[PDB]
Protein backbone atom coordinates (compact mmCIF):
# COMPACT_ATOMS: atom_id res chain seq x y z
CA UNK A 1 0.00 0.00 0.00
CA UNK A 2 2.96 2.57 0.62
CA UNK A 3 4.49 3.81 -2.58
CA UNK A 4 7.82 3.96 -1.28
CA UNK A 5 10.12 4.48 -4.90
CA UNK A 6 8.10 7.35 -5.88
CA UNK A 7 8.28 9.61 -2.73
CA UNK A 8 5.55 12.48 -2.87
CA UNK A 9 6.51 16.04 -2.05
CA UNK A 10 4.30 18.43 0.32
CA UNK A 11 5.02 20.78 -2.47
CA UNK A 12 1.91 20.75 -5.00
CA UNK A 13 -0.39 23.34 -7.09
CA UNK A 14 0.55 26.51 -5.24
CA UNK A 15 3.67 25.78 -3.07
CA UNK A 16 4.53 30.04 -3.20
CA UNK A 17 2.29 30.94 -0.45
CA UNK A 18 2.96 29.72 3.30
CA UNK A 19 0.09 28.86 5.71
CA UNK A 20 1.66 29.88 9.04
CA UNK A 21 -0.29 28.58 12.28
CA UNK A 22 -0.73 30.38 15.40
CA UNK A 23 1.46 33.33 15.70
CA UNK A 24 1.96 35.90 17.81
CA UNK A 25 -0.99 36.76 20.15
CA UNK A 26 -2.20 39.96 20.80
CA UNK A 27 -2.10 42.50 24.26
CA UNK A 28 -4.04 45.90 24.23
CA UNK A 29 -2.63 47.69 20.98
CA UNK A 30 0.35 45.54 21.04
CA UNK A 31 -0.23 43.59 17.87
CA UNK A 32 0.68 46.79 16.04
CA UNK A 33 4.34 46.15 16.28
CA UNK A 34 3.49 42.34 16.09
CA UNK A 35 2.43 42.60 12.51
CA UNK A 36 5.77 43.83 11.84
CA UNK A 37 7.84 41.37 13.61
CA UNK A 38 6.21 39.03 10.45
CA UNK A 39 7.64 41.25 7.82
CA UNK A 40 10.98 41.82 10.16
CA UNK A 41 11.74 37.59 10.49
CA UNK A 42 9.96 36.59 7.01
CA UNK A 43 12.03 38.09 4.96
CA UNK A 44 14.92 35.75 5.64
CA UNK A 45 12.88 33.90 3.56
CA UNK A 46 13.06 35.98 0.84
CA UNK A 47 11.00 39.03 -0.57
CA UNK A 48 7.86 39.77 0.90
CA UNK A 49 5.29 39.72 -2.16
CA UNK A 50 2.34 39.70 -0.37
CA UNK A 51 1.63 39.70 3.74
CA UNK A 52 -2.08 39.18 4.67
CA UNK A 53 -2.68 39.69 8.73
CA UNK A 54 -6.05 38.56 9.07
CA UNK A 55 -7.77 37.58 12.81
CA UNK A 56 -9.63 34.84 13.98
CA UNK A 57 -13.12 34.88 14.86
CA UNK A 58 -13.20 38.54 15.47
CA UNK A 59 -10.45 37.79 17.81
CA UNK A 60 -6.78 37.05 18.06
CA UNK A 61 -5.01 36.05 14.81
CA UNK A 62 -4.01 32.78 14.78
CA UNK A 63 -2.54 32.42 11.35
CA UNK A 64 -1.21 34.78 8.27
CA UNK A 65 -0.17 34.06 4.94
CA UNK A 66 2.67 35.05 2.88
CA UNK A 67 3.30 35.01 -0.62
CA UNK A 68 6.91 35.01 -2.07
CA UNK A 69 8.07 35.46 -5.89
CA UNK A 70 11.55 34.28 -4.63
CA UNK A 71 13.70 30.96 -4.38
CA UNK A 72 11.31 28.34 -3.64
CA UNK A 73 10.92 29.64 0.04
CA UNK A 74 8.11 27.56 1.09
CA UNK A 75 9.58 24.59 -0.29
CA UNK A 76 12.94 25.48 2.16
CA UNK A 77 10.40 26.57 4.68
CA UNK A 78 8.31 23.94 5.00
CA UNK A 79 11.26 21.08 4.79
CA UNK A 80 13.46 23.12 7.20
CA UNK A 81 11.17 24.82 9.88
CA UNK A 82 7.69 23.75 10.63
CA UNK A 83 6.36 24.01 13.86
CA UNK A 84 8.66 25.95 15.32
CA UNK A 85 8.52 26.53 18.99
CA UNK A 86 8.96 30.31 20.21
CA UNK A 87 7.95 30.47 23.34
CA UNK A 88 4.62 29.68 25.45
CA UNK A 89 2.13 28.90 22.47
CA UNK A 90 3.39 30.60 19.27
CA UNK A 91 4.62 27.78 17.48
CA UNK A 92 4.56 28.57 13.61
CA UNK A 93 3.46 25.37 11.82
CA UNK A 94 4.01 26.45 8.28
CA UNK A 95 2.68 24.20 4.88
CA UNK A 96 1.22 25.48 1.62
CA UNK A 97 -2.09 25.82 0.21
CA UNK A 98 -2.70 22.38 -0.03
CA UNK A 99 -5.20 22.34 2.53
CA UNK A 100 -7.75 19.67 -0.07
CA UNK A 101 -7.40 16.15 1.71
CA UNK A 102 -8.47 14.55 -1.76
CA UNK A 103 -5.78 12.00 -3.07
CA UNK A 104 -6.33 11.34 -6.82
CA UNK A 105 -7.93 8.15 -6.66
Given at each position: ????K ?5 A ?6 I ?15 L???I ?16 E ?9 F ?40
Amino acid sequence: GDVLKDRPQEADGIDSVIVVDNVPQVGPDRLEKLKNVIHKIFSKFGKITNDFYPEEDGKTKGYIFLEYASPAHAVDAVKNADGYKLDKQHTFRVNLFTDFDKYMT
